[PDB]
Amino acid sequence: AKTLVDISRAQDAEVGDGTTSVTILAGELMKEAKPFLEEGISSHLIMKGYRKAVSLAVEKINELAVDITSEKSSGRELL
Amino acid sequence: ILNVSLEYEKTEVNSGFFYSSADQRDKLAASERKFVDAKLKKIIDLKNEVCGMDPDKGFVIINQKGIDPMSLDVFAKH
Amino acid sequence: GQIIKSIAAIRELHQMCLTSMGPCGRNKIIVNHLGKIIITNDAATMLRELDIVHPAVKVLVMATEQQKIDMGDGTNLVMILAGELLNVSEKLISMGLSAVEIIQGYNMARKFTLKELDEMVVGEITDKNDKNELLKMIKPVISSKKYGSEDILSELVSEAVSHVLPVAQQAGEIPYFNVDSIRVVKIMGGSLSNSTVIKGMVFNREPEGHVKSLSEDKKHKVAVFTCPLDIANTETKGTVLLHNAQEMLDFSKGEEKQIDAMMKEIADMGVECIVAGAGVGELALHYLNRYGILVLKVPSKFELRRLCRVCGATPLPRLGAPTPEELGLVETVKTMEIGGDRVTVFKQEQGEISRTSTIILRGATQNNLDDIERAIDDGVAAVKGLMKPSGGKLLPGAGATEIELISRITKYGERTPGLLQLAIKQFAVAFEVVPRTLAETAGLDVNEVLPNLYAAHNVTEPGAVKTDHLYKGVDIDGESDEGVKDIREENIYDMLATKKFAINVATEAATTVLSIDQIIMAKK
Amino acid sequence: HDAIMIVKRALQNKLIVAGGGATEMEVSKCLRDYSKTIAGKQQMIINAFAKALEVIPRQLCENAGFDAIEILNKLRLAH
């Protein structure tokens, strides 16, 4: 349980936002994997399934995040 | 077998030789190496008289007591 | 039936090591009684932090340290194999076969295995010490420890090894690579991609002076002084005291004139760096800033030993006698900011080749930062295995070695008549724990991958000479695959010196346990 | 003064996303479609990660007084 505290201190230091949300997200992800243990699924494929989703999420966030400078905007009108 | 001390010795009470100039270096250090140089210079003369020419031979010193850093360079050349 | 319960006590700790070896392995958090948390993936290090109750377990712990001290690699192969040799012997002890002939069977099977290890060598390491050639040995060492860092850490470790090794070939008389030549340092911030390789020791402390770094001049003189910086007094007592205000002006100005006179003779000799192992006074730092001398303090005596092997400096028992014979020479020393903090490092250029290097690690995860620190130390011992005792020979890893030994041992089982056939057959079956552990921890079905492993090394070829693919190993998968894959694609190999030494230790470890039919203990 | 403090933090980092469950719901919807093209046990594992992302908008609605049961169905409908 100290791992959730260590990642929260780095969340408040390097960033400063999302200290509470990173623990709730890590905990809720743990609850979804609880019934997977009773079925006999090993943790190896469980980790590969989430790491693949995060890899596809980073590419999706970059598409969702809108960063424009010289296209239909400028350094002023954007803000 | 060599029973004499080849390492620098100090007075029974804690003391040291501190020189403030290059001239005082050989003056203070001579008291510690006085007993060392007397025995050491006589040992190296044995290598010239005995086992000087003869190949495939060697000379080993027991020296139960310690060894000073000064004699380490002398033993390496011979 | 204490011999059966003794195996069950080891069986409780056997599954602990089954979760260690392999890429699925994980470190274990242990809280010491002093309030210190030690976290490492290596199982041999964990054994020192665990309290052992049964004295029979200490036999395997003592045998585990034999693998770490000499070869330094394969500690998981010794403990896991020794635990399986007791399980396959549990059926023989129960069947009515005496433990005496069980021990005799392993001695005959051990000699048959050692002779086959020389014929299983595929490739040979030329000991070129090239940056690309070291990537083949280091990759499997980093493997089965930390995932995803095997590509980045391969270039960092192989680069530091080539810096401390001179240029030589076909000479095994004089040893070169030691175990202290690679130091691991860590700093908060950054990532693994921004990490670099330093040709010398790295100091993370402050210079403690207004001089940040020295100049670019070639062959900077470095002097190591064990005596602290202060006016010379009597070695016995010699406490400075003030009886009256008249002696205050003489004692205050006396320390200013004596220290400045000694620092002037050092700067005239060309020494721009003074290493003081003891404390430094206030008036000493003022004179060093005007002469442009870098201030360095190393109280640890262990760091001073590796420094003498680089520049050639020697610690002086006195102060103010810069003998040029014992002084060292460093090509370039600079103070740069790496990892977010400005630190003064130690490196070289061409001459005075350093025999000790340090790798700087960076990352945003504190738990994985200490795991890499312990993982690099296992890679340091892998370079030591390149020496004369079968350093160039290598065997295919990733479960390909343990499975191939099954066909060779069972071939010698029917060849040797007598009661030894029971121990020889069970000796080859005990090697099935290695492929089963990698397949079980990876989520792969035992009914799927395991029957394909036996069919990979056993085929029917219309000819006397073997052909097709003998390189098929055990695959962890993790994404998708059909059957198994060839090991020659990823070039994961195991050295002969590591595999051959791990078999003899694991054999003698199980021999001691099976030979003990009674254990006498006493309460403390 | 309030308008400057809002764009102040946006000037330090110009990479931003739409908050309020917008981005969180888009990621959960796409990962369910990407799992449909991925055979094996990783399909049900990625779907578990998409469901684990729903806890962030949940607690935001429950703490603000909104009903997390109704807003979950109404948001995904228009999504």
Q: Are residues C204 and C340 in the same domain?
A: yes
Structure tokens at C211: 């001089």
Q: Least CB-CB distance to C236: which of B14, B18, B25? A: B14
**Under 8 Å between Cβ of C335 and C212:** yes
Cβ distance C24 to A48 less than 8 Å, yes or no, reads no
Cβ distance D15 to A45 less than 8 Å, yes or no, reads no
Cβ distance C478 to A41 less than 8 Å, yes or no, reads no
Q: Which residues pair with C73 in a beta bridge?
A: none
Pairs of CB atoms within 8 A across A/C = 26
Structure tokens at D39: 């055979």
End-to-end C-alpha distance for chain A, whole angstroms: 41
How many C-alpha atoms does C407 have within 13 Å on its Cβ side?
A: 13
Cβ distance B16 to C232 less than 8 Å, yes or no, reads no
Cβ distance B18 to C236 less than 8 Å, yes or no, reads no
Q: Are residues C356 and C398 in the same domain?
A: no
Q: Are residues C38 and C101 in the same domain?
A: yes
Chain B touching partners, 3 or more CB pairs below 8 A: C
Those residues whose C-beta lies under 8 Å from the C-beta of residue C524, and which sit 6 or more positions away, are none
Residue C173, domain CATH:
3.30.260.10
| Burial annotation D35-68 (CB, 10 A radius, 16+ → b, else e) | beebeebbeebbbbbbebbbbbbbebbeeeeeee
Q: If 0-12 CB within 10 Å is exposed, 13-18 middle and 19+ buried, where does residue C102 land?
A: buried
**Under 8 Å between Cβ of D21 and D60:** yes
Q: Least CB-CB distance to B15: which of C232, C235, C320? A: C235
Structure tokens at C75: 């500690």
Cβ distance C442 to A3 less than 8 Å, yes or no, reads no
Give the pairing of strands C342-344 and C315-316: unpaired
End-to-end C-alpha distance for chain D, whole angstroms: 35
Partners of residue D40 in chain C, C-beta under 8 Å: 480
- Distance, in Å, from the CA atom of A76 to the CA atom of B11, rounded to the nearest integer, reads 85
Cβ distance D56 to A21 less than 8 Å, yes or no, reads yes
Q: Are residues C381 and C398 in the same domain?
A: no
Q: How many CB atoms lie within 10 A of CB D7?
A: 10
Domain, as residue range, for C521: 1-124+393-524
Which residues of A touch chain D, with CB atoms under 8 Å apart? 21, 24-25, 28-29, 31-33, 36, 41, 45-46, 48-50, 52-53, 56-57, 60-61, 64-67, 78-79
Residue C285, domain CATH:
3.50.7.10
**Under 8 Å between Cβ of D44 and A45:** no
Structure tokens at C340: 């977010």
**Under 8 Å between Cβ of C360 and C203:** no
Q: Are residues C9 and C24 in the same domain?
A: yes
Write down the residue that tokens 């607690």 correspond to.
D59
Give the pairing of strands C271-276 and C220-225: parallel
Q: Are residues C214 and C72 in the same domain?
A: no
Q: Are residues C208 and C264 in the same domain?
A: yes
B73: left (phi over 0), alpha (psi -120 to 50) or beta: alpha
Dihedral pair phi/psi, residue C218, rounded to 5°: -80, 140
Q: Are residues C118 and C131 in the same domain?
A: no
Those residues whose C-beta lies under 8 Å from the C-beta of residue C406, and which sit 6 or more positions away, are C428, C429, C431, C432, C454, C457
In which element (H, E) is residue C513 found? Answer: helix C496-515
- Distance, in Å, from the CA atom of C87 to the CA atom of C11, rounded to the nearest integer, reads 9
State how far Cα C194 lies from the chain centre: 23
Entry resolution (Å): 4.4
CB contact, 8 Å: A30 with chain C? no
Partners of residue C235 in chain B, C-beta under 8 Å: 14-16
Q: Least CB-CB distance to C443: which of A14, A42, A52? A: A42
Q: Are residues C346 and C359 in the same domain?
A: no
Q: Are residues C275 and C318 in the same domain?
A: yes
CB contact, 8 Å: D3 with chain A? no
Q: Least CB-CB distance to D45: which of A24, A46, A61? A: A46
Instruction: Read off the amino acid at residue D68.
Output: A
Structure tokens at D47: 């779907």
In terms of CA atoms, which chain A residue is nearest residue D35? A53
- In degrees, rounded to 5, the angle at the alpha carbon of residue C51 between the alpha carbons of residues C50 and C52 is 110
- Distance, in Å, from the CA atom of C339 to the CA atom of C360, rounded to the nearest integer, reads 9
Q: If 0-12 CB within 10 Å is exposed, 13-18 middle and 19+ buried, where does residue C103 land?
A: middle
Pairs of CB atoms within 8 A across A/D = 74
Cβ distance D51 to A21 less than 8 Å, yes or no, reads no
What is the strand order of the sheet C182-188 is part of?
A: C182-188, C357-363, C197-198
**Under 8 Å between Cβ of C402 and C67:** no
How many C-alpha atoms does C348 have within 13 Å on its Cβ side?
A: 23
Structure tokens at C484: 């198994």
- Based on the structure, what is the number of domains in chain C? 3
Residue where one domain finishes, among candidates C377, C392, C407: C392
Residue C25, domain CATH:
1.10.560.10
| Burial annotation C7-24 (CB, 10 A radius, 16+ → b, else e) | beebeebbeebbebbbbb
Structure tokens at B13: 């009470």
Q: Least CB-CB distance to D46: which of A53, A67, A79? A: A53
**Under 8 Å between Cβ of C25 and C144:** yes
- Distance, in Å, from the CA atom of A7 to the CA atom of A40, rounded to the nearest integer, reads 29
Torsion of CA C293, C299, C303, C306, to 10 degrees: 60
In terms of CA atoms, which chain C residue is nearest residue B21? C321
- Distance, in Å, from the CA atom of C157 to the CA atom of C39, rounded to the nearest integer, reads 22
Partners of residue D11 in chain A, C-beta under 8 Å: 79
| Burial annotation C33-65 (CB, 10 A radius, 16+ → b, else e) | eeeeebbbbbbbbbbeeeeeeeebbebbbebbe
| Burial annotation B41-56 (CB, 10 A radius, 16+ → b, else e) | eebeeeeeeeeeeeee
Q: Are residues C245 and C235 in the same domain?
A: yes
The closest of C440, A54, C477, A56 to D40, measured between CA atoms, is C477
Cβ distance C443 to A45 less than 8 Å, yes or no, reads yes
Q: Are residues C115 and C1 in the same domain?
A: yes
